[PDB]
Design a protein around this nucleic acid. Structure first.
Ligand code: SF4
Ligand SMILES: [Mn+2]
Lengths: 98, 342, 218, 98, 343, 342, 343
DNA sequence: CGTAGCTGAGGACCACCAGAACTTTTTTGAAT
DNA sequence: GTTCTGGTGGTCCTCAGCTACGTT
């Protein structure tokens, strides 16, 4: 499979445990994908990892105070993504040699 | 039925593979060079002096993410191997079978049969598409030689006989392997084998291909559940990946040296890349290494149809599914192991 | 057999044996496991609904979570998801509290009720198992289906009990023989989480000899 | 086609004229779409309006200093979006009875 | 720090390790703490979050020395090997021996003789220690019975007979065990064994200890390459480490029951930490469990002597060293498996 | 080949429409209710007292977006009309074709031919699905007599004749309309199409449908550049705004009456959704209005096939195409206007 | 504001319109600046970024009143009206008269009569204002020539004769105009006239004034209902607002050239703002055009009296009102269309 | 009213420092 | 060498606010 899935979060740090929630969400979401811009990640996952990540984040955040969006591009993502600026992202399908 | 996860080759020296949760991070005197999610990897290859934290190896061993260490030329310096899992049925079956010479022959038959069929069919593919370039009738004569010999190998009974016939086929195939320099100058002329120093070219690429294929066959076999250091054939020299050699004896011909010949004939590599020390055998070059690895990982994503299982699957999975098609035979769901007969 | 108390099989095997007589073999004999979406959801629900060290009562009835049980008659041990005790001077007094309570087993799952027996068999074992430890008679069961969030009653007769006994006997025989059988595959192994292991495809295809001989002659 | 594309920006405001660039980029991007999150818009366009927006937005930012990403989903976007938090987004195929 | 039978265990945590010349060097934040020659080593076993040094990793992997990295509490993490991997002939020897009655009964004799000797000597020592609160006659009678039973088990040749003798020895020790406790008998009374759903307090405690010890012994085996799931006395079944249960018989009593009785007699804990279950089952509280784990860890640092070799070493290395000897039995110069005969 | 665009309905009283760049924002005492981009809107409709920023009216008028103001019961008020955008020859042709009775009677011929065809065929269809409820015979009866009128309308040369025939099609169909209903007949005051302009129940939805359709067709025609609410076909009487809907007299009977009847028959509107004033006027509840608008948009979204070329087309484009073809006939490329015939 | 012509000409920017009972109220930043009735009004023209109270919009829509909205300067923004009234019949009449030629010739001769009257009287006043250094008898002779031409134009019957007799006056006006200016005569010249990309600074600034009057007249037509792209004297052509050009030529007198001479004289404009790019092009400098537009607005604020109506107004309302009378000609209330004529 | 340009006033988001620790049984878990 | 919890500072981000104006 290896479908491309994009995750964006947005937490509120004005409440009692705002910083704790932000730290935990950033750590929990960095485990599956990489970071392209602040508060957005893009990952190449199967269906099962997507379900597991969704369940983890849903359990970790609190509702009615945070926001989380999950988009999926299908399996034809190479012709759907366009980048202009100067914050390049490492892709995970090329030879990937350091 | 898998996804053929990616693979990481680190070449820059004096790095340090650290772990942060599920991420592998490459540190270098506190400078961060990058980080990768570890659910999108299969194997991680290190070059030169690259150290690993115990937490990282402990995390990678339990999820069948293999770690390998290489000095400069794909040596077997050090790998990582994890614990043993509770699947005693397969291991007991394998050990008992390896204790019986007759079953050893009944498996080595299929191994060498697949090998010689690979050799013959690839030789005929090479002949029919190349005209005045090659000596055609010598190729043809070797072809019926191999075709008749395969039927005789199929009915062998003892290991020594099968070893003799395997050696005969090996020499009678190297005789014409020496004949492919189609579109490159004489510096890529095969002139025999040298074991420890790659004193020539061609060897300096076949060695790399063989190391990178062995380190994949071993990982697949240890993933399926078997133990990969006891074998159905070869003299059981202690402490060598014997089963890996046995299972590679079939895809070596059609998956590694065909790749090197394709690389040379397309002129993707130039003789200026290589160099030599005072003796120094032959050492590849960093850009040359990068080109080799790029072409390798690019070819490892071609989609074929498997002969027996009849499914459309990627090229790199072939050394895995074959091993899995081994496992069920041990439980008796087939009649005999079908080798790869591309 | 440490003291005959070790040769016991888990109740989780009954549902697997009922569904895909190969699946139980793959899980409990080769000791391997693989998860997909539905398995992940099932495990997460089972884990979240697992709250030991706490009791919940309503003055009349009592509820217990993660109730360890075993039965020597079938040599079957396991863990009941929920046990409900009701107050009436009919049953057996139980350790810890006062009054007399009757028992009802409750096991949650994830999915629509299935046309085959399947789940029922597992639950039946629980009930029968409980009769050995709380020395009583049990003739009722509860199934909760969280995909519809519905609850279904289950009666028990001699038919179900004899079927369970025969199933346990055959399962023990297969285990003693270390043998993994073959079944009629069809379309159920499209969500069989072990589809990358049990390989339904090779169960129907030709013998190996014909293919090798086929590619030998030409 | 009238199909959905997602636009994200990331412009630094510590540079010489960063504040002006940020203000102009946000104002230019808000015209063609809807703000779902801070620095994340989504919009429904054809090919021509998308080309116009890309050409307009390529000049306000400066390369080697900023980042800008455009993702393109397809014509069946209703089944490729998930929302979990408390920042709901108005859909433009809903009858829109204000 | 310590080298036992050509192996090197680094038990203190947070100590980096590297190579210098042709020697291993220990470090602790740029402080030279130890230098050891690597001429005649056979393996390296680490316990800290060290990471070793890649120079030494290459050096040992080239010189046919494998490395095993554990955690400070004994769990198995990773094993760095080259081509050899070491354990192939040893594992083949185990698998070949696992399917014959004669050798399996021999090794079972080796285990059981050590078990009965340890039990008898502990009984006699406790008779000697405390006069007033003891029925001396019962213990001396059981001691004579156990001595005769040990002499008999030395000359066993069939699995069923050895199993029966093991059962009788277990019955004797169990019918002696209850009066061993000398404090807080109000709710701490032993009147039988029920491993699955343990009942009535103390039983559960005992079970927990066994589990920990088994896990420990399990990791011990994996240090050397013995296949943990194919036993010698206990028969193999999937999902259970039969050989660990075979091995941990000799160490069960002196190292688990003594610990539990020390906790009980020294008033290290009270019954308020055990919760109730409706069918009579008993569980442990998180605070009580953590106190138990901390007490186990602290006891693991007690320093004793080795009855068979004599080096003064901690308790925590007893399961490993014995296991190492087991390995040296399978392919080595050992005449017979040496049990942990500890007075 | 054009694509449909959305529409925005404003029901909250005392709001304010304001422009910002290309976004329309709704305020009410400086409280931003929401902002919508204006590049994917087709029209904007407002209820109650809502005002607009003159910049917004200028923007919408320039870019072909129609603003319309309404009151409580769709009482039309204050359409927003822009300027003259060019294509002067097309207006020249259209202004010459008027005031000449030959071409006028040709266009009237085609318009009323389409109307009669739609009415007859829809009635036959309805008697074709479920024949148990009503009398098929009489329904069939009406059919042929309308077919009779069809021949007459094709053999026509004078406008003054067709008006008379209008009455026939206006009195030979009403007698069926009361029998059109199936369910809830006793509750819904159902006196057929006996109508009263200030509304007397079961006509509120009818008038609402008529108003929506009229605004839609007016916008669709003005996009191309001509005005036909009192044009060449319809009478010169001021205040009889129907020719714009007479272009949709092919659709006035179909797409509005059919919608009302489908809602009534599908029991989706309950009699508690209406009320009557003290004097006798009849109004619709707000929730019922929201339900009606949701249903109207959902129906307008559904996609069908046009008879002419069959390119797969949507319902909201039915008026627009009817305008576009009327252009191509006035350019002289065709022979006579092909109306919409279902 | 409310001219005798039934329109409303609210021109103050940032005003507001609201409804009180049955009357309109002009709010000037939250106080009641003005109040007007609606009983006899017919249309409302609104300049400036403003609004209308929705009550006023609703009250205007029903009783056959159109609400036209422009910018402050005079660009056209939008129109609000219900069932459209007073546009279909007017535009159809426009097109019908555009078809024929007799009425077109009559209207064109009326316009040319107006233009010749304006220019002749402008020369009369120019020679009266400064009778010190000017060729008085030459201007008198030109005046008699154009008087006879005015009589001939009033005696015209065909388009060709009209065009021929119009083309004659152009060169005479060119020479006399070059002789007209008083100050800076040496510095700026008008020897030659070019409509396409111009030479000489004066010609280019005439072009700019023509463009501004062009936009104004186009909006003037659009606000009443008439077309743009079909004219009476100028023939129809796609993309050319022929009626706009006809009105431009009618009003090219006082409103354009007098502004030119005023800018040139009084030393209000200098030669530093005028340029040359290889073809005589006068690229207006940004400061020059800013001053030009400010002066244009200031002139538009100047008060004058309408020659026909007699009501005092601004210059900026001179075109629209004039154009509006054209509408009242096409509605049958007028016998002719005198812009500046005796009759 | 709309279009720009300057401020400021708080939140969101993330990278560095600093400190104190770091061990847990066995069974359940999908199939339109 | 990890992992979790605090503390600190520095930069993106959107809104509230005050000034200065609208033609080519
Ligand atoms: S084929 Fe798949 S579903 Fe069927 S028994 Fe085997 S593993 Fe289970
Ligand atoms: Mn359950």
């Amino acid at each position: 499979g290896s479908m491309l899935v994009l995750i964006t979060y947005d937490v509120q740090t004005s409440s009692m445990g705002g910083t704790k929630r932000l730290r935990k969400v950033a750590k929990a979401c960095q485990n599956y994908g990489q970071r392209v811009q602040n508060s957005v990640f893009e990952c190449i996952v199967d269906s099962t990892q997507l379900t597991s990540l969704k369940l983890e984040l849903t359990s970790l955040i609190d509702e009615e105070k945070d926001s989380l969006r999950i988009y999926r591009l299908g399996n034809n993502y190479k012709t759907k993504v366009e980048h202009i600026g100067a914050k390049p992202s490492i892709d995970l399908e090329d030879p990937l040699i350091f | 039925m898998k996804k053929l996860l990616n693979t990481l080759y680190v070449t820059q020296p004096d790095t340090y593979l650290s772990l942060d949760g599920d991420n592998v991070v490459l540190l270098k005197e506190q400078e961060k060079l990058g980080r990768l999610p570890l659910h999108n990897l299969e194997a991680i290859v290190g070059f030169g002096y690259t150290g690993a934290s115990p937490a990282l190896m402990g995390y990678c061993a339990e999820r069948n993410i293999s770690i390998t260490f290489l000095t400069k030329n794909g040596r077997f310096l050090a790998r990582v191997v994890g614990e043993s899992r509770g699947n005693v049925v397969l291991r007991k079956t394998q050990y008992r079978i390896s204790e019986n010479d007759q079953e050893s022959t009944k498996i080595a038959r299929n191994f060498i049969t697949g090998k010689v069929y690979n050799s013959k069919w690839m030789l005929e593919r090479m002949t029919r598409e190349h005209p005045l370039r090659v000596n055609v009738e010598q190729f043809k004569a070797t072809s019926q030689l191999l075709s008749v010999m395969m039927q005789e190998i199929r009915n062998c009974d003892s290991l020594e006989s099968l070893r003799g016939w395997e050696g005969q086929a090996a020499i009678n195939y190297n005789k014409v392997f020496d004949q492919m320099i189609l579109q490159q100058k004489e510096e890529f002329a095969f002139h025999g084998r040298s074991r420890r120093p790659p004193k020539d070219n061609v060897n300096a690429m076949l060695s790399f291909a063989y190391t990178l294929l062995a380190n994949d066959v071993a990982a697949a076999l240890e993933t399926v559940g078997l133990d990969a250091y006891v074998g159905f054939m070869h003299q059981d020299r202690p402490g060598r990946a014997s089963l890996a050699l046995d299972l590679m004896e079939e895809l070596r011909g059609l998956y590694a040296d065909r790749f090197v010949l394709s690389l040379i004939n397309r002129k993707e590599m130039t003789a200026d890349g290589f160099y030599k020390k005072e003796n120094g055998a032959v050492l590849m070059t960093d850009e040359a290494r990068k080109t080799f690895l790029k072409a390798w990982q690019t070819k490892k994503q071609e989609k074929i149809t498997h002969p027996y299982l009849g499914e459309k699957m990627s090229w790199g999975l072939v050394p895995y599914v074959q091993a899995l098609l081994l496992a069920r035979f041990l439980r008796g769901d087939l009649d005999e192991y079908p080798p790869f007969l591309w | 057999a440490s003291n005959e108390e070790d040769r016991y099989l888990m109740l989780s095997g009954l549902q697997h044996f009922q569904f895909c007589k190969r699946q139980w073999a793959l899980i409990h004999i080769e000791q391997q496991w693989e998860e997909n979406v539905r398995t992940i959801e099932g495990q997460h629900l089972h884990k979240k609904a697992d709250q030991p060290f706490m009791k919940e009562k309503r003055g009349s009835k009592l509820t217990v979570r993660a109730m360890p049980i075993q039965s020597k008659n079938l040599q079957i041990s396991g863990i009941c998801d929920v046990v409900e005790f009701v107050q009436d001077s009919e049953g057996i007094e139980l350790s810890g509290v006062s009054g007399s309570y009757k028992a009802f087993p409750v096991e949650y799952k994830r999915g629509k009720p299935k046309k085959g027996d399947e789940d029922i068999v597992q639950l039946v074992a629980q009930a029968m198992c409980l009769e050995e430890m709380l020395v009583c008679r049990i003739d009722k069961g509860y199934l909760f289906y969280n995909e519809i969030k519905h609850r279904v009653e289950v009666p028990i007769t001699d038919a179900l009990r004899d079927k369970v006994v025969q199933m346990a006997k055959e399962m023990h025989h297969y285990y003693e023989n270390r043998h993994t059988p073959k079944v009629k595959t069809g379309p159920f192994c499209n969500n069989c989480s072990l589809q990358s292991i049990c390989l339904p495809k090779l169960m129907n295809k030709r013998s190996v000899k014909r293919y090798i001989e086929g590619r030998l002659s030409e």
